[PDB]
């Protein structure tokens, strides 16, 4: 609406600082994930032999059957949390259907 | 958008894009009747404030510019709607009232007002919408011997609810002795006659009041003005005017099984998610046109002058509202950056696993994982 | 002529058993828990079982009418303040065959709403509100089994007609082996559950017990 | 067991649902739909109603941004604790009691 | 005659809720921690005392 | 006052989110006290010899 | 609204009203009899299920 | 924390299921089904 | 010695004191008492106040 935008233009610069705050939070989330997880410099690989003195490590090491290289316990934790897709894969394309 | 003339290397959100409407369609029901507002605003004698009439007005092509040529009033006082805007919008049911009051109690015909007329004669609802028309009538309703043809009530046991009438004539019990239809001590008639004369002041002169009340509800509209309809279009970004639903969206055929009485289709999304045509009887969908954010990917102006544009939430099959390398990311779709089958460190982060960098090998802006 | 044909009525108070939910608006909704404030009869209330085998009934803010008779003795209804001539005269008389709603008052050839279309083991349910001039009438034809009393379940009441009088209604009379239920409406807040379609399948009375207050 | 991550999803779902639901309020105006005000009234009175709606929606958006900033601070504190636990529990051996 | 601040605070719609753990239970927890520290060292923080 | 409540109902759901914030703070205080003080699984006691 | 009780406040003869923080009319003087009445609000609280 | 209606007080001591107030908790227990309150 | 817990008490006391004291303000209206606004005026003007 053009008239609402013209009347909103008189209220100053609230929206630029709201956008600045939201962009700062969005950068901070990626900084959090990068600080927690990327603590290693090289991607180490486990050897093809799987003997570690009798310790199994089979439910925490990945298996190549899944298209996403995740362990068993990681699959349980990802199935446990009822996490929405949150409009990720082209939400306007998803909303254009006849439902 | 940065209020600066040198920009550093990164990704910046500049503005948003939208798809403009193409056409404008008006859908009004097929009515041809002209209804006599002249029969209300011009009559020999009007009703009283305790016996005001009510005229039902429905299925009418209403032109509200002819009222100014029928009565000489000061102001076309309308509360919830503009007087001059009445041609465009339209409602379902129209009512007309008429009564004659004096000059002292003209202001009491208003929502949330207290007085003799507002309590015992005629009460308006608090959420009233419509138009109230009042003008002086000392040249018609005054006599040199006294105009006693108009009656108003002053004694009652309770206050009137909004939009009510009372024509009962019983002697009020102001004391303990029963009147039994005989006036006397503590026995006064409820109908006090008006004493209208043309020799009085400006405050005691009679006034003619005609009230139009508009019934805005969810029923299908019957009274709409002389505005031409337009043929239907589908699967396009178009401005629609279905009943009073002025809005922008894309019209598709719907599957929502409407009940035979239902007209609107507001889901938890609200904002009239579905709508019914008044011309034909077919359900239709409402969805807004394509929009999203624009992010500009560039290195610094000290280095180069090339940019890349990212549209978020769009797969570039609907993109228009270098310039030839189109890449489909997951965070949207990428314009102006080539894709390579390599892997480096992240220089400018775009989205889910995709980064961008300014590459020496002819210079270009490259995108990778 | 005038007569007195089986005018002896007998009362026996029974339970409402969560019956009498209608659609409060003209808007279509799907899979939404929506809260509306309107005149509904409360859940588990005290409705009656007037058996006549009839002076008046006190109308107040709506009447939940029901009738389980398969002999179709229930034909029409009479509303108004005083059911005679002179002041506050009104008739909302209905009938069988072609259902006409003649509002021609006793006192005088007044206005009419003579509109034709037909209104009609089975339990008919009706709600007669009188709000803002419109005389809203709701109905739902529902099969019934498992002996007497009002059954357990949820039957949404679709609107049937609408009728703009703008009048004073105080009394109520049923025109006629006879067994009809009369319940009254009061302003209550409900929470209504819509399924994938628009059909209401579950409701919560937000003022019955504290558990329903927690749910609302 | 996984209530923290579920709360992380649920808080933003509830916040976005409340921010969407705040668009249907009137804030003292005559209609919650802008085009109804543009089609019903003249310029000045509809400008007054538009100003009422602008003030209400600005207050709602500022409330959402402030709550997001506080929740981002809490999330960053938990992410710093998680990064410390990754550096000390996983990449070494810890002598700190109950860490 | 001397109206309290807490009376006006309660009367104007502001209510202070009591804590879940009373001060006697807090003193009991502190006493248990002191008795474990005195009579068992650090062994009560890693298993049985 | 009933008129003030009817006018306050036009402003949306500010009261519900204020109540939610205060309820979260009130639960968080008990969580803080529980995670500070309730660190021992059993209630030990000192023998009577001192 | 509230509960009227007999008061022991020392109203000097030029005074008629009573007040505390947040404009709370604690006391009042009757126009017919020379008596002080305390005003305190009626009982209220919160309901939890 | 006020007074409680609908839950019976017992002279026992369990873990806190539903927190009420200053050292009082409530729970649903099998031993005729009923809602009890305790310290 | 114990100034931190004293500050914890004092801050949450004076916040409620300020919240109570903020009911005396007019905020541009004609009176800070709601009943006087309701009694003194008609529907629309009292609605504005
Ligand atoms: C390591 O643990 C896995 C379980 O995750 C063991 O695999 C199971 O072994 C039993 C006994 O032979 C089988 O019945 C199951 O079908 C196996 N589950 C699988 C393969 O998913 C595995 O044996 C353990 N490693 C060793 C060396 O014992
Ligand atoms: C209006 O149009 C509809 C369909 O376009 C038609 O069925 C109807 O008879 C028309 N009404 C009149 C009065 O012409
Ligand atoms: C008012 O109506 C009457 C009857 O229709 C008509 O004769 C008269 O001329 C009208 N008044 C004016 C001023 O035209
Ligand atoms: C829109 O994007 C999705 C996401 O990859 C894609 O599958 C789909 O094919 C795109 N639409 C068209 C018309 O190509
Ligand atoms: C209905 O009211 C009567 C009044 O005597 C009472 O006896 C009866 O139990 C009530 N029915 C209910 C509450 O279901
Ligand atoms: C409606 O009827 C009642 C009962 O007879 C009566 O007291 C009241 O005055 C009537 N109201 C109107 C507007 O006729
Ligand atoms: C909705 O209607 C369809 C058919 O129109 C039916 O198959 C489906 O079961 C219905 N869903 C309900 C009643 O929840
Ligand atoms: C008014 O009332 C007071 C106390 O009731 C009394 O002392 C006084 O004389 C009365 N005045 C009149 C004029 O009646």
From Swiss-Prot, chain I:
Changing residue 38 to F: In strain: Omicron/BA.1. This is Spike protein S2'. Subunit of the fusion protein that is processed upon entry into the host cell. Mediates fusion of the virion and cellular membranes by functioning as a class I viral fusion protein. Contains a viral fusion peptide that is unmasked after S2 cleavage. This cleavage can occur at the cell membrane by host TMPRSS2 or during endocytosis by host CSTL. In either case, this triggers an extensive and irreversible conformational change that leads to fusion of the viral envelope with the cellular cytoplasmic membrane, releasing viral genomic RNA into the host cell cytoplasm. The chain holds residues 944 to 992 of 1273 of the full protein. Residues 6-49 form a coiled coil.
């Amino acid at each position: 609406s053009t008239e609402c935008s013209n009347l909103l233009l008189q209220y100053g610069s609230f929206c630029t600082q709201l956008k600045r705050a939201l962009t700062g939070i969005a950068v901070e989330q990626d900084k959090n994930t990068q600080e927690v997880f990327a603590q290693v410099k090289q991607i180490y690989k486990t050897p093809p032999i799987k003997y570690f003195g009798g310790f199994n490590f089979s439910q925490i090491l990945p298996d190549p059957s899944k298209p996403s290289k995740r362990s068993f316990i990681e699959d349980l934790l990802f199935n446990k949390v009822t996490l929405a897709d949150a409009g990720f894969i082209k939400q306007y394309g998803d909303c254009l259907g006849d439902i | 958008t940065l209020k600066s003339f040198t920009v550093e290397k990164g990704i910046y959100q500049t503005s948003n894009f939208r798809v403009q409407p193409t056409e404008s369609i008006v859908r009004f029901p097929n009515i041809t009747n002209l209804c006599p507002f002249h029969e209300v605003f011009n009559a020999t004698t009007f009703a009283s404030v305790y016996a005001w009439n009510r005229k039902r007005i429905s299925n009418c092509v209403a032109d509200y510019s002819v009222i100014y040529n029928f009565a000489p009033f000061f102001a076309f006082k309308c509360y919830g709607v503009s007087p001059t805007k009445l041609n465009d919008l339209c409602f379902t049911n129209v009512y007309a009232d008429s009564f004659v009051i004096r000059g002292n109690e003209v202001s009491q015909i208003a929502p949330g007002q207290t007085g003799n007329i507002a309590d015992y004669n005629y009460k308006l609802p608090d959420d009233f919408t419509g138009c109230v028309i009042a003008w002086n009538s000392n040249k018609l309703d005054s006599k040199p011997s006294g105009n006693y043809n108009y009656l108003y009530r002053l004694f009652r046991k309770s206050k009137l609810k909004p939009f009510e009438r009372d024509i009962s004539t019983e002697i009020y019990q102001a004391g303990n002795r029963p009147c039994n239809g005989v006036a006397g001590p503590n026995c006064y008639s409820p109908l006090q006659s008006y004493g209208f004369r043309p020799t009085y002041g400006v405050g005691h002169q009679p006034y003619r009041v005609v009230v139009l009340s508009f019934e805005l509800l969810h029923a299908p509209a019957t009274v709409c003005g002389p505005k031409k309809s337009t043929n239907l279009v589908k699967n396009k970004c178009v401005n629609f005017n279905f009943n009073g639903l002025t809005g922008t969206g894309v019209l598709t055929e719907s599957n929502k099984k409407f009940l035979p009485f239902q007209q609107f289709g507001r889901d938890i999304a609200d904002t009239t998610d579905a709508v019914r045509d008044p011309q034909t009887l077919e359900i239709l969908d409402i969805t807004p046109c394509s929009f999203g954010g624009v992010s500009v990917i560039t290195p610094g102006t000290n280095t180069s002058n090339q940019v890349a544009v990212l549209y978020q939430g769009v797969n570039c099959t609907e993109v228009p509202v270098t310039g030839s390398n189109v890449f489909q990311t997951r965070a949207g779709c990428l314009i102006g950056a080539e894709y390579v089958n390599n892997s480096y460190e992240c220089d400018i982060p775009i989205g889910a696993g995709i980064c961008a960098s300014y590459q020496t090998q002819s210079q270009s802006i490259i995108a990778y994982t | 002529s005038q007569c007195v044909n089986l005018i002896t009525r007998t009362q026996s108070y029974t339970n409402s058993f969560t019956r009498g939910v209608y659609y409060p608006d003209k808007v279509f909704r799907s899979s939404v828990l929506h809260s509306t404030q309107d005149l509904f009869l409360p859940f588990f209330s005290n409705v009656t079982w007037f058996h006549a085998i009839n002076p008046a009934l006190p109308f107040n803010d709506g009447v939940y009418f029901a009738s389980t008779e398969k002999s179709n003795i229930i034909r029409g209804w009479i509303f108004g303040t005083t059911l005679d001539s002179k002041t506050q005269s009104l008739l909302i008389v209905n009938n069988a065959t072609n259902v006409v709603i003649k509002v021609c008052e006793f006192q005088n050839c007044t206005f009419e709403y003579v509109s034709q279309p037909f209104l009609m083991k089975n339990l008919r349910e009706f709600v007669f509100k009188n709000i803002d001039g419109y005389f809203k009438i709701y109905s739902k034809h529902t099969p019934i089994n498992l002996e007497r009393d009002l059954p357990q379940g949820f039957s949404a009441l679709e609107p049937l007609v609408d009728l703009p009088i703008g009048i004073n209604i105080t009394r109520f009379q049923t025109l006629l082996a006879a067994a009809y239920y009369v319940g009254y409406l009061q302003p209550r807040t409900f929470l209504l559950k819509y399924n994938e379609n628009g059909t209401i399948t579950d409701a919560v009375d937000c003022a019955l017990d504290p558990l329903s207050e927690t749910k609302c | 067991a996984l209530g923290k991550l579920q709360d992380v999803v649920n808080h933003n779902a509830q916040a976005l649902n409340t921010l969407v639901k705040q668009l249907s309020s009137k804030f003292g105006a005559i209609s919650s739909v802008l085009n109804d005000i543009l089609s019903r009234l003249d310029k000045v009175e509809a400008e007054v109603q538009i100003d009422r709606l602008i003030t209400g929606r600005l207050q709602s958006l500022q409330t959402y941004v402030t709550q997001q900033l506080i929740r981002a601070a809490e999330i960053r504190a938990s992410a710093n604790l998680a990064a410390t636990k990754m550096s000390e529990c996983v990449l070494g051996q810890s002598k700190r009691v109950d860490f | 005659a001397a109206r309290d601040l807490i009376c006006a605070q309660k009367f104007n719609g502001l209510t202070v809720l009591p804590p879940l753990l009373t001060d006697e239970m807090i003193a009991q927890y502190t006493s248990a921690l002191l008795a474990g520290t005195i009579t068992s060292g650090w062994t009560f923080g890693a298993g049985a005392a």
